Design a binder for this molecule. Structure first.
Ligand SMILES: [K+]
Length: 176
């Protein structure tokens, strides 16, 4: 539960869209570093709640975030303006740094179109090193949106969440 010693790393602002997203203010720099902490302890009007980030993206001025379990407008409005904390001894853990191909075999890659709708890009087929960076190879499947093979950079700003439980990888990557 709520850690005794904690640091405020941000604040959920206004509701964004109709799919439960929310604008969020970060106390970290670069701002998106707030997304490397898992989980989040937010103080809502109905007590404390622990929350996991599923995906996020910069939008014009600032940032908008998608929290696991918050999928509608009403779910976002009831969190609006709540503060975000982390334990004093909580180290950031970006999933890109914590996972390797062997752990990812057979996961579905979920991208995001311009209209913030989740698209089944396909399945992770390979994850190699080029020398300068790591690249994730995604191949189409019968479930997939199309038949293309996509090269997606294995960088924390693109591949944001690995969820072995759901067998999915959430990436801020579009169709075209
Ligand atoms: K397909």
């Amino acid at each position: 539960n709520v850690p005794e010693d904690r640091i405020q790393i941000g604040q959920l602002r206004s509701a964004y869209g109709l799919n439960g997203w929310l604008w969020v203010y970060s106390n970290t720099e670069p701002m998106s570093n707030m997304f490397d902490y898992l989980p989040w302890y937010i103080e809502t009007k109905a007590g404390w709640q622990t929350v996991d980030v599923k995906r996020w993206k910069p939008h014009g001025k600032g940032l908008v975030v998608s929290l696991k379990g918050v999928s509608d407008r009403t779910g976002a409005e009831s969190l609006v303006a709540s503060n975000i904390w982390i334990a004093k001894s909580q180290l950031p853990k970006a999933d890109v740094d914590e996972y390797y191909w062997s752990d990812l075999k057979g996961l579905t890659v979920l991208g995001l179109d311009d209209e913030e709708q989740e698209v089944n890009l396909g399945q992770i087929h390979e994850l190699f090193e080029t020398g300068a960076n790591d690249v994730m190879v995604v191949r189409a499947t019968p479930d997939s949106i199309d038949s293309e093979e996509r090269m997606i950079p294995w960088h924390k700003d693109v591949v944001q969440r690995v969820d072995l439980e759901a067998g999915r990888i959430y990436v801020n990557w579009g169709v075209d």
